[PDB]
Amino acid sequence: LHKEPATLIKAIDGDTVKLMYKGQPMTFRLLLVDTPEFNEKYGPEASAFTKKMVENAKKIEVEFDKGQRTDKYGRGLAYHYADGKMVNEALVRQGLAKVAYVYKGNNTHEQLLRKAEAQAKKEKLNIWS
């Protein structure tokens, strides 16, 4: 896998963000996670977490996995990095997302994320409280 550049257009919620990628606007859905919807418990906290992380970043990068790069809704599917830190992992580490939507061939970072979820669960963080 490799990182590619992108720029923030807009934070949307905990697990979706609008980015300019190869010069085109695209909504991205973060791989291998599920944040609560804004209207659910921890939804606002997930959205705010992702928003800060991507808005504060000097450099956003996306990393596609080895399978499908767009979902059925036309959303990009990627791992996202804010000054080199993975947003997808950071959400799970904080108990603001669950590992989810683990599909064959787009699962390169599954066990990394599961390890973060286990530490979040141990700490009874947010969703795991």
Ligand SMILES: Cc1cn([C@H]2C[C@H](OP(=O)(O)O)[C@@H](COP(=O)(O)O)O2)c(=O)[nH]c1=O
């Ligand atoms: C994360 C992810 C979601 N999706 C689709 C599956 C779900 O379909 P359904 O809408 O039919 O439930 C939906 C979940 O996204 P959200 O959690 O953003 O709703 O997005 C993928 O197809 N691939 C993925 O890698």
Ligand SMILES: [Ca+2]
């Ligand atoms: Ca969601």
